[PDB]
Design a protein around this ligand. Structure first.
Ligand SMILES: *[C@@H]1O[C@H](CO)[C@@H](O[C@@H]2O[C@H](CO)[C@@H](O[C@@H]3O[C@H](CO)[C@@H](O)[C@H](O)[C@@H]3O)[C@H](O)[C@H]2NC(C)=O)[C@H](O)[C@H]1NC(C)=O
Ligand SMILES: *[C@@H]1O[C@H](CO)[C@@H](O[C@@H]2O[C@H](CO)[C@@H](O)[C@H](O)[C@H]2NC(C)=O)[C@H](O)[C@H]1NC(C)=O
Ligand SMILES: *[C@@H]1O[C@H](CO)[C@@H](O[C@@H]2O[C@H](CO)[C@@H](O)[C@H](O)[C@H]2NC(C)=O)[C@H](O)[C@H]1NC(C)=O
Ligand SMILES: *[C@@H]1O[C@H](CO)[C@@H](O[C@@H]2O[C@H](CO)[C@@H](O)[C@H](O)[C@H]2NC(C)=O)[C@H](O)[C@H]1NC(C)=O
Ligand SMILES: *[C@@H]1O[C@H](CO)[C@@H](O[C@@H]2O[C@H](CO)[C@@H](O)[C@H](O)[C@H]2NC(C)=O)[C@H](O)[C@H]1NC(C)=O
Ligand SMILES: *[C@@H]1O[C@H](CO)[C@@H](O[C@@H]2O[C@H](CO)[C@@H](O)[C@H](O)[C@H]2NC(C)=O)[C@H](O)[C@H]1NC(C)=O
Ligand SMILES: *[C@@H]1O[C@H](CO)[C@@H](O[C@@H]2O[C@H](CO)[C@@H](O)[C@H](O)[C@H]2NC(C)=O)[C@H](O)[C@H]1NC(C)=O
Ligand code: NAG
Ligand code: NAG
Ligand code: NAG
Ligand code: NAG
Ligand code: NAG
Ligand code: NAG
Ligand code: NAG
Ligand code: NAG
Ligand code: NAG
Lengths: 111, 118, 427, 117, 117, 117
């Protein structure tokens, strides 16, 4: 019941950089995770909270954010690292629970 | 490790119970198991979550009265649709969200998912 | 720009006020404001507020009021001063098990009758924990405090009450899972009245409280400072079944005009020891969860050892359990006996002379209850203290540390509706 | 019934009818109720007395004759009414409350009365 | 000091200064007096708060911005002001009290203030 | 905080914001405080009710529709406002208080309301 995402589609050259951005309708601290979904596959977790990568995630992925403004930067884009990226609110400010509670996205990142 | 089943082609107007199991894990730990939907060509949508030590559930507002979630065996969970329509054709996934600091946001275990066609 | 005055602005500041009670029983009082059958809860979007359960004055009010009620309710009752007489007393041996040898004694004495010029010879069976050997015995506390019996019609059931702020004030609730004892939380709502809190009185194991919703919560001041208590809130109940198996009878003995003493009577059937049964597998899973959470503050490979108790008096070393109006002091050992790297039967004792909130200068006598008592309760949390390996054991202390576990979610604030801001207007 | 729920002063100024009403709305739990009722009345009347003396009685929004002194703030109205929570604002200028209130009283007694009679 | 003594609303509306004043006017019979004084004050203030929020403070007769909804009555003003006792009238429309009061509050907060500032 | 310190009515009429504020400002010394707080509130409200019914609410100085009856005094305004202490004045016309107050109520109920509706 919290997130929206706005870039829709982005194209970049191999070795370039793209960024995407999400917003929350309610303040959620740093409670935003990020996912990478390749076509035909279940999604992979990249980011736990606004500033923390999962082990095994390349260092070229990074991000930040707080309150209602959250971003993801993907540098050194690899050839054919195409994916749909998503944001998830991991905190429900209404019930107080701290679990995935609202999801959305769509980025069409193509390289 | 999470494996979905109970999918397939069903007729409009019926009900449906999807299930998944954790191969290698007991769910009696600090976990949330959440159901996520993805219609072809669409992004990921939240349906609802179950906390497994203390069974308590949370639902997406759009899912209320349409979906229920429950736990059965110590290693399995279920998602029950109360009715289905053609608009509900989608890939369904269960995923585990583990405990990090103040946030059960470690949504790193996703099953392959299963398809439901109506 | 000009000063513009606004009234009814949504502004609040920390405050301390007395609270109203909303809801014959000793605490229920039956003089509380009827509650709202459809109470409101108002969510505050984008509000982060700071709470501190260790400095929460709602705890102090609960403590002060419950003590005052204890006396207001039990004060107008029969005094037992005439029982502070030398007793002649021997062991009950007629039909007992081994576990009960020396537990009960058959005492007899010379006491005042309806007429002051006449005496009667009466007897009562006393629990060992209520007498002092001088075959001559004294009752406990005849050398320390006056003993008043509780009125037999007064219930000790922990009937819940709600606290309500006066108009002009509000109570903020922290609706935040995984919130510890202190600090800011991003999920706050406004209520006028608290949830109902049962005035349960116990030591070591907290009974019939609220449960945590996501994980076992460990709340303490400091943590690293081992002088503080750790309040552990379970996210699942553990069911505990307590009993007093002997079928008792009681006698009413006049002690003078208008008053009578409730003496114990004879026992029907054989005499057995009181005990509590804690489901074993449930208890083992519950502690495993407590341990996994404790390690977050002590190390992932740190050994967590649970010991039975420190030395001390019954109020410290045994579980304190009040059910049916009977007072139990349970062994609570074997529940805390592990390192972490059927049912558990807890033998339990019964005592009738009670010294509780007012530790000295006052005593109360719990009259006997006829028949057999069976009581089932929910263990909702633990009071632990801490000593390569960390050692934990059941603790205790004043009731304030038990009652604060139900009030950690609340703060009292005052509303300050009048204030100003610059605007492009003028008079 | 409270606001300041992400509500900036502009929006917050419109919810005043709610917060303005919840200001008034010998056993241990007997005497305490009597004392609590008296307290609720006392607070209500103190605020009403201030509105009365400043000429703001009967109003939720009251423009006055006291100019804003820039020493009281470091922001434009275009910044505070749109970006600040009423609650944040009240904290930021809290140390000037007594100045403004004294000025508001003079702005009535003299300007609207001694000079009008 | 009470009216409604055969006094229809027209005539009754003129006696309001009397009924409006008789609203304010540790032994067994000690503590009870203290409790009774507090009650009398409480009722007085609740009515004054409503007049304040509706913009009727200081008045006995207050015309407002809320139109009369015909769903609230089955009579013309020419019938009720001349033939009905104030008391009868109050009983006949008693089930709409809460509707009218909510409308009266909005009719001030928005119409006379948010839209005037 | 009191005036009448050689202050004639003219000067005294300008200090009203001070004297108007100091009107509101189970142990032996416990129950007495509760009783005293109730008394302070009661007096405050009685004066406010009179200002309300006379149409003087919210004002320190209130001109009304009641003409001065010469039977109430033996002095010109040029004599009393400049030579008499407020306190002296109040004593000199104290026996007419109830006359003036009744006239003030009629001067509102009828003249400003029944005749304006
Ligand atoms: C924790 O909560 C439970 C459930 O409310 C409490 O158990 C209840 O205890 C009361 C007092 O002993 C029982 O009332 C008695 O019932 C008998 C009839 O069986 C009647 O003759 C007595 O006069 C009295 O009314 C009540 O039945 C029992 N409830 C249940 C479901 O068994 C328990 O006491 C609480 N724990 C603590 C420590 O307070
Ligand atoms: C909590 O703060 C957020 C912004 O940080 C507010 O969200 C915006 O509200 C405006 C309306 O005032 C909308 O036009 C924007 O589109 C919203 N932003 C997003 C990302 O949706 C939110 O309204 C605040 N909460 C409350 C109750 O006012
Ligand atoms: C022990 O805990 C259980 C589980 O929370 C309590 O049973 C629930 O009580 C609520 C009402 O308060 C019902 O809405 C639930 O449906 C009940 N759940 C189950 C599984 O029965 C039980 O009342 C608690 N016992 C005590 C003494 O507090
Ligand atoms: C405590 O008492 C409860 C009953 O009040 C026991 O649970 C029952 O066990 C029987 C089998 O012996 C079942 O048929 C019932 O359905 C159970 N009832 C409930 C409500 O679960 C419980 O086992 C006892 N606990 C201990 C530790 O002895
Ligand atoms: C904690 O457990 C230890 C180990 O059982 C207790 O020490 C002795 O235990 C035996 C029974 O195994 C008793 O017969 C001895 O009398 C106990 N020693 C002493 C000095 O009492 C220890 O007492 C237990 N502590 C508490 C508070 O129960
Ligand atoms: C009680 O009701 C009667 C009518 O049923 C009222 O009597 C009439 O009053 C009007 C003035 O309003 C006079 O013009 C009529 O001549 C009266 N009728 C008769 C037969 O004399 C009476 O006034 C009511 N009582 C009160 C106090 O208003
Ligand atoms: C006390 O009374 C004396 C007069 O009897 C007042 O003194 C005069 O005050 C006026 C101003 O109102 C001055 O112009 C005169 O010059 C003063 N007379 C003298 C001899 O100095 C005095 O002001 C009164 N006290 C107060 C506080 O008003
Ligand atoms: C206690 O002593 C009396 C005699 O005074 C006797 O009748 C009674 O049976 C004894 N009770 C027990 C439990 O021994
Ligand atoms: C009573 O108990 C004491 C302590 O165990 C024991 O020494 C004594 O012999 C017992 N008396 C009888 C009659 O059994
Ligand atoms: C009662 O008093 C008499 C006095 O002769 C004494 O012998 C007897 O032991 C006393 N009995 C009891 C039970 O105290
Ligand atoms: C009462 O007697 C016991 C005997 O063990 C003693 O310890 C206690 O201090 C005495 N009470 C008082 C107030 O002296
Ligand atoms: C509670 O959480 C805060 C951070 O939100 C932390 O600083 C504090 O130390 C925690 N309390 C305890 C007892 O660890
Ligand atoms: C505890 O368990 C024993 C069997 O080990 C049983 O005989 C006893 O009645 C049980 N007690 C309670 C209170 O359930
Ligand atoms: C608890 O029971 C044990 C026997 O297992 C005993 O040694 C210990 O002294 C008892 N503790 C208390 C506090 O009664
Ligand atoms: C603790 O465990 C040991 C076995 O390791 C057992 O012999 C002992 O009786 C247990 N203690 C309690 C109080 O049950
Ligand atoms: C309790 O946990 C211990 C490990 O700490 C394990 O060895 C034991 O088998 C468990 N018992 C039960 C009933 O689960």
């Amino acid at each position: 019941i919290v997130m929206t995402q706005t870039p829709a589609s982005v194209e970049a050259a191999v070795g370039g950089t793209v960024t995407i951005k999400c917003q929350a309708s309610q303040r959620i601290g740093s409670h935003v995770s990020w996912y990478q979904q390749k076509p035909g596959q279940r999604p992979k977790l990249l980011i736990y909270g606004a500033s923390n990568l999962e082990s095994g995630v390349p260092s070229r992925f990074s991000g930040s954010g707080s309150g209602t403004q959250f971003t993801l930067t993907i540098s050194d884009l690899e050839c054919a690292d195409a994916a749909t990226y998503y944001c998830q609110a991991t905190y429900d400010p209404y019930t107080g629970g701290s679990y995935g509670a609202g999801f959305g996205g769509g980025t069409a990142v193509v390289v | 490790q999470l494996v979905e089943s109970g999918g397939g082609l069903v007729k409009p107007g019926t009900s449906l119970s999807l299930t998944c199991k954790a191969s290698g894990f007991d769910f009696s730990d600090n976990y949330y198991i959440c159901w996520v939907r993805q219609a072809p060509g669409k992004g990921l949508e939240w349906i609802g979550c179950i906390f497994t030590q203390n069974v308590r559930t949370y639902y997406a507002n759009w899912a209320k009265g349409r979906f229920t979630i429950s736990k059965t065996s110590s290693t399995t969970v279920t998602l029950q649709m109360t009715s289905l329509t053609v608009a509900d054709t989608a890939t369904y996934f269960c995923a585990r969200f583990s405990d990090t600091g103040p946030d059960y946001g470690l949504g790193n275990l996703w099953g392959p998912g299963s398809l439901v066609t109506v | 720009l000009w000063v513009t005055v606004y009234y009814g602005v949504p502004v609040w500041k920390d405050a301390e006020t007395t609270l109203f009670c909303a809801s014959h029983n000793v605490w229920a009082t039956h003089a509380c404001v009827p509650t709202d059958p459809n109470p409101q809860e108002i969510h505050l979007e984008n509000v982060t507020e700071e709470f501190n359960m260790w400095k929460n004055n709602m705890v102090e009010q609960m403590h002060t009021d419950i003590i005052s009620l204890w006396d207001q309710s039990l004060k107008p009752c029969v005094k037992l001063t005439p029982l502070c007489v030398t007793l002649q007393c021997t062991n009950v041996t007629n039909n007992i098990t081994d576990d009960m040898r020396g537990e009960l004694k058959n005492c007899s004495f010379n006491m005042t009758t309806e007429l002051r010029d006449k005496k009667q010879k009466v007897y009562s069976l006393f629990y060992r924990l209520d007498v002092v050997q001088i075959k001559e015995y004294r009752l406990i506390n005849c050398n320390t405090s006056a003993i008043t019996q509780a009125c037999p019609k007064v219930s000790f059931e922990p009937i819940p009450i709600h606290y309500c702020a006066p108009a002009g004030f509000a109570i903020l609730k922290c609706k935040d899972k995984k919130f510890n004892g202190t600090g800011p939380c991003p999920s706050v709502s406004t209520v006028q009245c608290t949830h109902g809190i049962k005035p349960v009185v116990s030591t070591q194991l907290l009974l019939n409280g609220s449960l945590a919703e996501e994980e076992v919560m460990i709340r303490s001041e400091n943590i690293t400072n081992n002088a503080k208590n750790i309040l552990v809130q379970f996210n699942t109940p553990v069911q505990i079944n307590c009993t007093r198996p002997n079928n008792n009878t009681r006698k009413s003995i006049r002690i003078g005009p208008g008053q009578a003493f409730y003496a114990t009577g004879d026992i029907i059937g054989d005499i057995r020891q009181a005990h509590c049964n804690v489901s074993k597998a449930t208890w083992n899973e519950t502690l495993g969860k407590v341990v996994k959470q404790l390690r977050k503050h002590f190390g992932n490979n740190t050994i967590i050892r649970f010991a039975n108790s420190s030395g001390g008096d019954l109020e410290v070393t045994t579980h304190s359990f009040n059910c049916g109006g009977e007072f139990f002091y349970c062994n609570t050992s074997g529940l805390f006996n592990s390192t972490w790297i059927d049912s558990i039967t807890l033998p339990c004792r019964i005592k009738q002379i009670i010294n509780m909130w007012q530790r000295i200068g006052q005593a109360m006598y719990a009259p006997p209850i006829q028949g057999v008592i069976r009581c089932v309760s929910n263990i909702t949390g633990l009071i632990l203290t801490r000593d390569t390996t960390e050692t934990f054991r059941p603790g205790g202390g004043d009731m304030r540390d038990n009652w604060r576990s139900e009030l950690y979610k609340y703060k009292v604030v005052k509303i300050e509706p009048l204030g100003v801001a610059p605007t492009r207007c003028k008079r | 019934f409270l606001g300041a729920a992400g509500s900036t002063m502009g929006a917050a100024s419109m919810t005043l009818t709610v917060q303005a009403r919840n200001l008034l709305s010998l056993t241990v739990w007997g005497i305490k109720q009597l004392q609590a009722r008296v307290l609720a009345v006392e607070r209500y009347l103190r605020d009403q007395q201030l509105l009365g003396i400043w000429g703001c009685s009967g109003k939720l929004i009251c423009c006055t004759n006291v100019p804003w002194n820039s020493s009281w703030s470091n922001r434009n109205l275009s910044e505070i009414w749109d970006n600040m929570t009423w609650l944040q604002w009240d904290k930021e200028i809290s140390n000037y409350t007594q100045i403004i209130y004294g000025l508001l009283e003079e702005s009535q007694n003299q300007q609207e009365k001694n000079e009008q009679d």
